Amino acid sequence: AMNAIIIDDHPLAIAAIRNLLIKNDIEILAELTEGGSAVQRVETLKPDIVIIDVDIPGVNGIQVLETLRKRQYSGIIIIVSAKNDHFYGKHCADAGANGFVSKKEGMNNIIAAIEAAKNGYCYFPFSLNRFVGSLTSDQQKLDSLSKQEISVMRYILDGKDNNDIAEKMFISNKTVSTYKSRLMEKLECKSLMDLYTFAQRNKI
Amino acid sequence: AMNAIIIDDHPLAIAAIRNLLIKNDIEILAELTEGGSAVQRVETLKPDIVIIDVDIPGVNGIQVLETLRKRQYSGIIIIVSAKNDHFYGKHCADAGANGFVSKKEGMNNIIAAIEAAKNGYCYFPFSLNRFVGSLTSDQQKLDSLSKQEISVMRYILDGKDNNDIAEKMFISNKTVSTYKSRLMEKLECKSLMDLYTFAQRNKI
């Protein structure tokens, strides 16, 4: 058969994911609810498939991916999000994920992603907005962001303050300000209303 | 309710794709065997789906892709190829296709790409070598080629010589040795052996 490790802090998502994998004769080696032990458990148990939420606490899902790939892990890693996060897929792809899937539309895209991977394909959100319409220059601006700048952005859009971010990202306040300036500058935003509107327009 | 145009000149590949589409309840508005009329007929007929082989004569399959997208067509485009062309996929992704599929492993990845596109995802070959192991730099040198260098490389690897290519690509024998030089320079290859060896090492 085929087996997996699931990494998600959301109790309901864990359940639906678990339930989906069983339904498809995939055996679950372990279930994790934080990212700080993830690298280790993955490397030890060596599952065919890893499913990781992009927002696990401790060490986030993309940081786990970069670390695993850096350390020559060659399994299927599928990243998932509770948000739409369609712009984030590109960054996950650049880091070596086999796919990125939003849980918003349910669990079938996860199994679809696992299938693609089994066949040598990767499975990521498509933005027509990269190639068509008036939103292309906005859409590359997003593509220029650092992994970390993206974290801070998404945290700002959830309305978190510098301290909440620092604590979550295990960085100092100054490092958050710095990432926040770099972020704003790349987005051509000066004020919070600029950012609000930027986000509305690109539907983040 | 779903419909397609198929653009391939390989008689068996046409038959197989046609059959596959039919069995998945996809109507075929038209079948083409060259790329000269392709932009026009797509825009005339407005199919949900277009399936284009990367080597149709006249206007190159990825050229069509680019044209349709700069001319704002917003349907599903899936490039296909008779060879593995693993690296070619990134270029089609960067040019706005929804997917790239090798016919080598059969038609079932075409229907899967289509189901991906219908769910808002794209379906491209996964290159582990881009992220893990000893071939990561080679793997990005291939990513650097221009559309024209690729065409030429793919021809060298096919066994065409300078004349065949000049004829094939509609150009003079020295616009080809031009392309041939930047190609080799980007791939850091001196001799034909350096190239053969590179192609063996990276599986092209």
Swiss-Prot record, chains A, B:
Residues 138-203 form the HTH luxR-type domain. SMART domains: HTH_LUXR, REC. Coiled coil: none annotated. This is DNA-binding transcriptional activator EvgA. GO terms for biological process: phosphorelay signal transduction system; regulation of DNA-templated transcription. It comes from the Bacteria. Keywords: Activator, Cytoplasm, DNA-binding, Phosphoprotein, Transcription, Transcription regulation, Two-component regulatory system. Phosphorylated by EvgS. SUPFAM superfamilies: C-terminal effector domain of the bipartite response regulators, CheY-like. InterPro entries: CheY-like_superfamily (IPR011006), RcsB_transcriptional_reg (IPR051015), Sig_transdc_resp-reg_C-effctor (IPR016032), Sig_transdc_resp-reg_receiver (IPR001789), Tscrpt_reg_LuxR_C (IPR000792), WH-like_DNA-bd_sf (IPR036388). The lineage of its organism: Bacteria, Pseudomonadati, Pseudomonadota, Gammaproteobacteria, Enterobacterales. Residues 3-118 form the Response regulatory domain. The keyword Phosphoprotein applies. One of its GO terms (cellular component) is cytoplasm. Homodimer. It is found in: Cytoplasm. Member of the two-component regulatory system EvgS/EvgA. Regulates the expression of emrKY operon and yfdX. Also seems to control expression of at least one other multidrug efflux operon. Residues 162-181 bind DNA. GO terms for molecular function: DNA binding. The modification 4-aspartylphosphate is found at D53.
